[PDB]
Amino acid sequence: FSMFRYSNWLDKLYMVVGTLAAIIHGAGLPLMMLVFGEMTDIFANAGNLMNLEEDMTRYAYYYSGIGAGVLVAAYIQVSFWCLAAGRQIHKIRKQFFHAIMRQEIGWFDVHDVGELNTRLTDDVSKINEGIGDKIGMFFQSMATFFTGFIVGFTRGWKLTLVILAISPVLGLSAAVWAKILSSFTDKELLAYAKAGAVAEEVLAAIRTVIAFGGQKKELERYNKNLEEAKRIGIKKAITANISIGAAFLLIYASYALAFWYGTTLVLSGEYSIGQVLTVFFSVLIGAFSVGQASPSIEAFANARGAAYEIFKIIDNKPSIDSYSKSGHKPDNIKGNLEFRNVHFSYPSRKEVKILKGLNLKVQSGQTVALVGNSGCGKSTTVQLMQRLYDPTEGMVSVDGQDIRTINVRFLREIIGVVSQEPVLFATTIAENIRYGRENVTMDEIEKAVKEANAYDFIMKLPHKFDTLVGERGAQLSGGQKQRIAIARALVRNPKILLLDEATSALDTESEAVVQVALDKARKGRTTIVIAHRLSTVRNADVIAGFDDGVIVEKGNHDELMKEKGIYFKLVTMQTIPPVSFWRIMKLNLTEWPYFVVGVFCAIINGGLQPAFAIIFSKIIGVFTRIDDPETKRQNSNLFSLLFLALGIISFITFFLQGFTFGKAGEILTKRLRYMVFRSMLRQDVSWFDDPKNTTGALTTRLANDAAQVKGAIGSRLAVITQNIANLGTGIIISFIYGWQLTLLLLAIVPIIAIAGVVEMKMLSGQALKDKKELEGSGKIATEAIENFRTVVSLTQEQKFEHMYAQSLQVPYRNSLRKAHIFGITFSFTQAMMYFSYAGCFRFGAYLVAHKLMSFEDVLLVFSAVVFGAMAVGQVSSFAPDYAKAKISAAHIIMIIEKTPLIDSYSTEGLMPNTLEGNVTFGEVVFNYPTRPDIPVLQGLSLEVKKGQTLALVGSSGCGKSTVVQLLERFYDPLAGKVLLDGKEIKRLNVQWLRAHLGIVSQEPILFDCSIAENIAYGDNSRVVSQEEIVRAAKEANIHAFIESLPNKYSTKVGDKGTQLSGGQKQRIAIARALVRQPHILLLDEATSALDTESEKVVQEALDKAREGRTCIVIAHRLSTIQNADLIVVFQNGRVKEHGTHQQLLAQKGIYFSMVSVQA
């Protein structure tokens, strides 16, 4: 795939013409230098002696002409190329969505929905970035390179050879530097990936860590990793700065050598100095445009893969052509389905066969139904019924004709399908119903909604035919949604209607009306029903028993019952923070002996450019002086050597300039992370529960932060320093040497700087705000791709595609306008730069002709100002992006400055010696901070005495774990008092309490460490001797299990407990909890899924240690209730049953009912 631009042959006119324009623009610059060379000679000749006004004026005319030529050529290239890119991208996006909507259902099953959606959303943008702007830039760069070498050879015979001989050395050195930088970057990536794995492991189990209060250990480990992270980061920054310095040094060495040799030759009577100027400038500019081209080829290579994938999808041909119009289109469709030996297997799992052959004939006006055990395949049966799939081995026909023979669209349009969980499109209810059929009028909608028995629901909500189905728009009830879907199906005027789990839950009266309407449609429409309610099959015209992919039962309900088949058995069983640089300089603490050196080096570097202008103007002036003794040679030689120094110093300072800055930033990282992380732990778990603080989000903020803030502070300061130094020094020194020309160039500078920044951003940031419009239009794509099943079911694909086309045409013209605007901007910038030469040198000719200054002086001012503006633009655009960095810095400032309500880091809390162990919850009422309105506690109460075996029971999911979580003060209680030993719980030491108690989660978490260390992790603040760990393990009865394993406890835990089985993992967790010997123990489903003997051993250990050790127990096994000292049952946030197990059993009810159900 190298030629994938494959649309709008006429648009190819833009492709070539723009390219052509690029060529000339690329060639424009060396030509401009050519004349400049000759131009200089004129001055050098004229000063060596007058009619300079006319010659200067005609050269300025040449410059203006070439400038206008560029003003046309650059605009043409950029505009035309972006036009072609935009048009092709629009066409390919339309075709891509069209192809996706045409794919087969099984293909969607295999291919991830989110991957495909993000593919559409991002790869098209990648292709857009891979053509238009970048291609124009590449062609212009290559043209500039070629033309520069051509000019060098033509006007230069020996100097060009030496320059082009030096160039490959520069190329090799730069490539080596880039490779070294990439290697260092990858090594640092891995080095920090270590610490990042550690951070992920600690954060993902924040509940356990905060419960055990192991904050210190985790923080110490993270600091340990951060040390190596910082070391390698410092190495990387040093290497990057040294590479920059080496590039500078090589460039200035080339300058020195070229001017040395050219001065030698010209002193030897060779071509004039102007010839040297033109040849050197042109050759170097070409030999650096060659490298300037590379980003474009990188972008094109990137886009090649996206194009490959997208075209591979597009060219895919599906067997079930949902769009093919060649299929038969029967009209007199008498209701009749006939499946013969129908065998099927899901394409995702071809090995597993669901249907093992099936025969079934259903005649017109028949109510057929399917019944079977779990996995009976009824759902797959109906799916294959609508022709969504094809029969693996068998045949299916409608009205006596094979299903395949008929057109897929025609067959689909005559089949109503209602799933077990319909969802409506996020739009108006009228639109949702209209999606059933296009040619449907509001009267038809009224009739359908009346039939579905929902007119009251529609007329109750405001905007009957206008209520949207978006966020809070689609708040309709499940029954209301089912009614809406039924109405949609009815509006389809289908022949065959299939339904499954029609009206699960909710009032049956709505189910009654739904069934009545379905029966009324049954008068003429064949029906298939997958319903669990007995009444559904009570009047069913026929019921078929699908078990193990075999249809056995055949007959009415009475007939099947008389055979005592599975039907009878089933029936019986039924029975944007604000930031600021002043407030953001938190690194000054570790920056005082660093920022001073940084600013010093930056000042030196900035002044370096005006020094180069001084030397350049002096060298040129060494030949405009008429004295012309032999000393000129020496003079030139001397100046040449200065370049080398002007080069060498540049490297040295840079080596220091990075070392103070690169290190500084790195240092800041080692603080900021160690601060950020340190702040994260000292926080309330509620904050973690929020979706904003997802583990991935926290690790991204804690990892993709160093470079951000480092840039925002250090790089901003350094770039600003260098910019101000360079430009201010240039302006001042220009004013000293000449006034009028300095004023004119000062007037022109801002245009040059704007042009430089825009050119630098041309190849980087072409698509920034387009993503907004793309997302705005992509709601349709997300709808269709996510909900594709219903879309294909009711054949609404065409309307969705047309809607997408409109939504995409909304920004299409905007994209074309953006293309034209960018082209005009770039072209005007280039032309303004070219006119700068003409204006400045014409004014200089005027000045010199009146002895206002020496040509050396005007050249000095011109070079100083122009090159200063261009270099300041370049260095400003080379820095890492600031706005994103400032935003990230502000975000992390918010994170670090955040102070928790439960200051676990705070040591303020009553710490009485020992504890009585009486836990009292009175009118305890609280709700999750995520959903405070929904109550989790309803004034529940619980009184527990010292060493009292308390058991908690209730409906699964009632909020049992909520009480345990509150015991750790993870979430504050809205109402009621929680007291330990008759004391204010909140008034106690939060850390002291969290250490005193002990809790085993319903799903204990184990860190990747040695078993001994993991067990000892339970009790922090003091190393637990191996004897204590062994005793605890024996108490939990796992010591033998660990000793059996190789290396004993010394085994390294596999990822996610890979090495150890969950059964042993739960026992290990129990041992860890018991190690601390907590005053109060909390076990939540401690039995879980394990051997009953393991639960017996754990209970025996707890009972042995139970005395003087209060316990709270939750589980779904009744055995735990037998030995409970006291029992309690939670009911809707209120404890209903209180007392002993025997007393509760005698008072038959919730406890007795639960025991009977389970037992």
Ligand X SMILES: Nc1ncnc2c1ncn2[C@@H]1O[C@H](COP(=O)(O)OP(=O)(O)OP(=O)(O)O)[C@@H](O)[C@H]1O
Ligand Y SMILES: CC[C@]1(O)C[C@@H]2CN(CCc3c([nH]c4ccccc34)[C@@](C(=O)OC)(c3cc4c(cc3OC)N(C)[C@H]3[C@@](O)(C(=O)OC)[C@H](OC(C)=O)[C@]5(CC)C=CCN6CC[C@]43[C@@H]65)C2)C1
Query: Per the annotation, where are the binding residues for ATP?
Result: 372-379, 954-961
- Binding flag, residue 504, Mg ion (CB under 5 A): no
Query: Which of 83-97 are b and which e, b meaning 16 or more Cβ less than 10 Å from the residue's Cβ?
Result: bbbbbbbbebbbebb
The CB-of-29 to ligand Y minimum distance in angstroms stands at: 6
Count of positions (residues) in the chain? 1159
Cα 410 from Cα 322, distance rounded (Å): 10
- Binding flag, residue 655, ligand X (CB under 6 A): no
Distances (CA, A) of 81 to 137, 197, 444, 815: 10, 45, 51, 13
3-state secondary structure of 343: strand
Cα 142 from Cα 133, distance rounded (Å): 14
- Binding flag, residue 1114, ligand Y (CB under 6 A): no
Encoded tokens for 178: 């880039």
Cα 527 from Cα 512, distance rounded (Å): 17
Cα 170 from Cα 173, distance rounded (Å): 5
Residues in contact with Mg ion, counted by CB under 5 A, come to a total of 4
The candidate with the shortest Cα–Cα distance to 856, out of 630, 610, 631, 615, is 615
The candidate with the shortest Cα–Cα distance to 256, out of 641, 557, 587, is 641
- Binding flag, residue 829, ligand Y (CB under 6 A): yes
The candidate with the shortest Cα–Cα distance to 848, out of 833, 858, 834, 839, is 858
- Binding flag, residue 171, ligand Y (CB under 6 A): yes
Residue 354 interacts with, from ligand Y, Mg ion, ligand X, none (CB under 5-8 Å by kind):
ligand X
Contact indicator for 405, 338 with CB cutoff of 8 Å = no
Between 48 and 874, name the residue whose CB sits nearer to ligand Y. Answer: 874
- Binding flag, residue 755, ligand Y (CB under 6 A): yes
The CB-of-487 to ligand X minimum distance in angstroms stands at: 24
- The answer for 1021, left when phi > 0, alpha when psi is -120 to 50, beta otherwise, is left
Of these, 379, 787, 1020, 1077, which contacts ligand X (CB under 6 A)?
Answer: 379
Considering only residues 227 through 246, tell me which ones interact with ligand Y, judged by CB under 6 A: 243-244
Between 375 and 750, name the residue whose CB sits nearer to ligand X. Answer: 375
Between 289 and 515, name the residue whose CB sits nearer to ligand Y. Answer: 289
Residue 376 interacts with, from ligand Y, ligand X, Mg ion, none (CB under 5-8 Å by kind):
ligand X
Instruction: Please calculate the CA angle 730-735-741 and round it to the nearest 5 degrees.
Output: 100
Contact indicator for 824, 693 with CB cutoff of 8 Å = no
Strands 526-530 and 542-547: unpaired
Of these, 379, 397, 556, 695, which contacts Mg ion (CB under 5 A)?
Answer: 379
| Position of minimal CB gap to Mg ion | 379
Of these, 251, 958, 1045, 1118, which contacts ligand X (CB under 6 A)?
Answer: 958
Of these, 207, 378, 1072, 1141, which contacts ligand X (CB under 6 A)?
Answer: 378
The CB-of-922 to ligand X minimum distance in angstroms stands at: 20
String of contacts with ligand X for each residue 903-932, x by CB under 6 A: -------------------------x-xx-
Of these, 878, 910, 932, 1048, which contacts ligand Y (CB under 6 A)?
Answer: 878
Between 136 and 479, name the residue whose CB sits nearer to ligand Y. Answer: 136
Of these, 109, 200, 228, 903, which contacts ligand X (CB under 6 A)?
Answer: 109
The CB-of-877 to ligand Y minimum distance in angstroms stands at: 6
What sign does the dihedral 152-154-155-159 (CA atoms) show?
positive
Distances (CA, A) of 529 to 454, 468, 503, 594, 979: 21, 30, 12, 78, 57
Residue 275 interacts with, from Mg ion, ligand Y, ligand X, none (CB under 5-8 Å by kind):
none
Q: Which stretch binds Mg ion (CB under 5 A): 489-497, 987-995, 998-1006, 1013-1021?
A: 998-1006
The CB-of-292 to ligand Y minimum distance in angstroms stands at: 4
String of contacts with ligand Y for each residue 279-308, x by CB under 6 A: --x--xx--xx-xx-xx-------------
The CB-of-870 to ligand Y minimum distance in angstroms stands at: 4
- Binding flag, residue 501, ligand Y (CB under 6 A): no
Query: Which of 441-471 are b and which e, b meaning 16 or more Cβ less than 10 Å from the residue's Cβ?
Result: eeebbeebbebbbbeebbeeeeebeebbbee
3-state secondary structure of 845: helix
Contact indicator for 710, 592 with CB cutoff of 8 Å = no
- Binding flag, residue 1063, ligand Y (CB under 6 A): no
Burial, 750: exposed, middle or buried (Cβ in 10 Å; 0-12, 13-18, 19+)?
A: exposed
Contact indicator for 1112, 1082 with CB cutoff of 8 Å = yes
Half-sphere exposure (CA, 13 Å, Cβ side) for 856? 15
Encoded tokens for 504: 């699960």
String of contacts with ligand X for each residue 1093-1132, x by CB under 6 A: ---------------------x------------------
Looking at this protein, which amino acid is placed at residue 1018?
A: G
Of these, 20, 72, 174, 253, which contacts ligand Y (CB under 6 A)?
Answer: 174
Residue 670 interacts with, from ligand X, Mg ion, ligand Y, none (CB under 5-8 Å by kind):
none
Phi, psi of 816 (to 5 degrees): -60, -40
Residue set of the binding site: 372-379, 954-961
Between 151 and 337, name the residue whose CB sits nearer to ligand X. Answer: 337
- Binding flag, residue 1002, ligand X (CB under 6 A): yes
- Binding flag, residue 693, ligand Y (CB under 6 A): no
Cα 469 from Cα 458, distance rounded (Å): 13
Residue 867 interacts with, from ligand Y, Mg ion, ligand X, none (CB under 5-8 Å by kind):
ligand Y
- Binding flag, residue 689, ligand X (CB under 6 A): yes
Of these, 7, 508, 918, 961, which contacts Mg ion (CB under 5 A)?
Answer: 961
Looking at this protein, which amino acid is placed at residue 986?
A: K
Cα 363 from Cα 542, distance rounded (Å): 11
Interface positions with ligand Y (CB under 6 A): 29, 33, 171, 174-175, 177-178, 243-244, 247, 251, 281, 284-285, 288-289, 291-292, 294-295, 609, 755-756, 759-760, 829-830, 833, 867, 870-871, 874, 878
Interface positions with Mg ion (CB under 5 A): 378-379, 961, 1002
Interface positions with ligand X (CB under 6 A): 109, 346, 348-349, 354, 374-380, 689, 928, 930-931, 936, 954, 956-962, 1002, 1114
